[model samples]
Target: SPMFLPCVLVPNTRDCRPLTYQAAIPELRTPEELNPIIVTPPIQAIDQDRNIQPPSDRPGILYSILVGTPEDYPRFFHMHPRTAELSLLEPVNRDFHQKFDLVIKAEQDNGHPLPAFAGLHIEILDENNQSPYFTMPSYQGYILESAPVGATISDSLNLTSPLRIVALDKDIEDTKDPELHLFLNDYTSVFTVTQTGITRYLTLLQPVDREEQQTYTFSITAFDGVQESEPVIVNIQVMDANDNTPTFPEISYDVYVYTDMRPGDSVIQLTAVDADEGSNGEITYEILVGAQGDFIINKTTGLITIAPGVEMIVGRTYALTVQAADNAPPAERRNSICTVYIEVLPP
Candidate 1:
């Protein structure tokens, strides 16, 4: 910042002041080493008489800072009388010092010319040595096995705690917006993430079947060049999608009806199951063959009965093909087929 210096007894600023200056150092990129602290431009102070100039000048103080304490000259920094410039002494760590405030004085050896002053400000920035970290150690998410291509797990999954997955650099303010990411690997990967507007979403990549897998878990972390982060765990629960077909227990059935059985008399009962939820698992029955309407089958109840006006001959064979299906749209209303053999009289 360039501004007029404070007033002397003269009560003047620009004229009464020696000189004022400002230095915005580049981000502290190098690390805990001498080479890391390269030379910086000299902070030159000016006196009314140029003779009392920068060839040899003294800073108002041995000024240097620490994690926020006074640091005498660890050569945390040293000003060269020759150039009025500064040099690194031992080395500084952000852990040690985040910023520093110092002033420089310029004057003639005879004291005829009053001294001038300069302001020195130093701040720390990010270093590749710094590592990134996650907001939490783990996260939770969910999605339906029938989730679409672009649907986000975070949006579909209703979780109150970890609403999103976030990894931030410890040196955030100084970092160049550390490019954080969760690597999306092969289909085997349990989870992945993609940036949505302002936030993020765990996207689905491979085909999913809830029947095969109910849950998923994986390790994730973000990165920025050489910077690394501690791996964090993410848990994802998969919901049902009726990807499975209905299952009938029996391969085939043999039934015997007595000659006295009348119309509307229940002759056979069909039962089936599907590995799905609610409507998807509810089984319905349909007679595919051998029914001839003489044997009526209930679609919802899966019960087979002798149709009205049906007369059974003493010796006759009735073969039937039955299908069991669930009410699911995507799985194409998955169905299973079974057969039944009915003989007229008791076997």
Candidate 2:
């Protein structure tokens, strides 16, 4: 873009009075298609004696008129026959010998426009496919009445496949058929999730009566296999393992006594337990007193029945304190104290 050419008054010419030829061009739809287009032609004069020098002081356009090879000629634009018409601009400063014999012509109009364009960029890469979420977002696991539900959990990051939740996303969206679901607290369905979205699963059906449905929550879901959610509710809380066996709820437990004795009758007899089978040998009973009225004291059956005048003079020991509890719902209470030493041999 060099610009200087202007006064070309051949219009109504007195003979052509105003002439100022200096040139420059390159900005016609400036798409800069790999730039290169100069047309400098004006530099010549051999000896003219008196005459017409006004096509802008004669020559100086760096002329090169050839229609033959210098490789079919593109020796930069020559243009000199009174500047008829020209256009090529997209270079603002750089003429290293016109770029070492320059050759850059690109402009067609079918879509003509280019020199250097920059406006689009994209770069994004992160893929593990996603499936890892369980931090109290709701995952309750409690089974202790002898906990065992397929039991095999271990992952301190040792996850070679640790969290074990085998697959869901059963067909529909990219259908290979697998969506992920497992149920069995009471809802009962059992197991099926293997297209591989992997969401916490373990159960092929093999446990029954760890005290009958002790703990097994339900709900787990994740879908990109399409989309459907609201079933992530897993709340399992069952942990109490003394192993069920404490019953005295009612078989017979009654007490009342009225044969008074004036010698430390600390009257005792209230202990009946039956923990049918779990905390080590479950049934503890008390009350083995030899002649309670001879030594009167079957308050409830630490029985000392020998009732004449009640005479167990200095041998009375009824230290009974039995406590048993376990019908499992969280039941576990155990205590056993027994001592029934009564002596009245001088009767």
Candidate 3:
């Protein structure tokens, strides 16, 4: 800052005026901390100086400033010898996770420290700067084909309990009412999401049939006000459930065998169809009634053969029943029965 020197009146002598001398200081001082000194120049000097210079002749109040070492300081804060003002450089720019501290120093002209340290705390207001992120990259799950629509798919097999999508946001204060939106990509008809505050639950929207499709793959996305995040893939496997009954093409079967037919000769081949998938659709053959000691049925191939060492009399008609059952549990087991008539003919 510019400095001034004062002038004194001359004693009661004749024709003499007071004189003053002024010089510029080399170093600048904090105008906020130091008050300006006022001085009155002599009338003659004021006139002479006006002839030499005008009001704007001297430079504006120059500031010899010193800033902190770390250059990555918050752009919102600005400090100088005069009053400092803090405001947003850009709207919705401040992040709640970032912090800043400004430490000021008081020093003399010769770089000597004064007994003063002014510290300022700068708290940036929270804004929507970050979006929510999920904890896991993807999820794998399974559900039974018999599970009803609207049933939660999480509890079917080794899945998480009360399945929910979890996410985290850096702007804690701004996320209380984030009102996140959740949806599946391209699988809207098969699943739906419901939000309970910060938690989102996934529920089945349509029943799944394992026979139709074994696996379903879809991605989920969450939107939290500011932005939508990358998609998270969810793979669901449909497990087979015993829901179909085995069917035989015909109600009864008839076969003719010679009286001298050798043992282990294949008498007939039985066939059945099950509409279910996987193990539920697998069929097994059994002699359910009245065929014991006379015939043996192949459990896998449904082939029935004459029992070894069984004597068959000519012109005899044998009555028997054969059963074809699926591999489902007894609770949901299904079977089809077919009557068989074997007529023995003389060789």
Tell me the lDDT of candidate 3. Answer: 0.62
- Provide the global lDDT of candidate 1 against the true structure: 0.63
Tens-place lDDT per residue, model 1, 1-347, is 12223433445443445433443333443333333333233344333343345635343322222221255543566665434545665445566666676665555444353544555566655466667777777767777788776556753355333347656665556534556655533333444576422244676667567888877777775666776577777777877777777777889998888887878999899988788978888888899889776798899999999999987677878889999989877546788888988888753
Q: Which stretches of candidate 1 lie over 4 Å from their true place?
A: 1-32, 35-37, 40-75, 78-87, 93-130, 155-163, 174-178, 184-191, 195-198, 247-273, 277-279, 282-313, 319-323, 327-339, 345-347
Q: Rank the candidates by lDDT, best first.
A: 1, 3, 2
Residue-wise C-alpha lDDT for candidate 3, range 95-147, written one tens digit per residue? 32243444543333434333223333433344455676667898767777787
Better of 1 and 3 by TM-score: 3
My TM-score estimates for the predictions, one after another, are: 0.53, 0.28, 0.61
Q: Any runs in candidate 2 off by more than 4 Å, and if so which?
A: 1-144, 148-167, 170-228, 235-241, 244-259, 262-266, 269-284, 288-337, 340-347
As a TM-score, model 1 comes out at 0.53
Number of colliding residue pairs in each model: 2, 46, 0
Work out candidate 3's RMSD over C-alphas. 14.6
Q: Residue 181 deviation, candidate 2, in Å?
A: 12
Alpha-carbon lDDT, every model: 0.63, 0.36, 0.62
Q: Give the higher-TM-score candidate: 2 or 3.
A: 3
116, model 1: CA deviation in Å?
A: 17
Residue pairs whose backbone atoms clash in candidate 3 = none
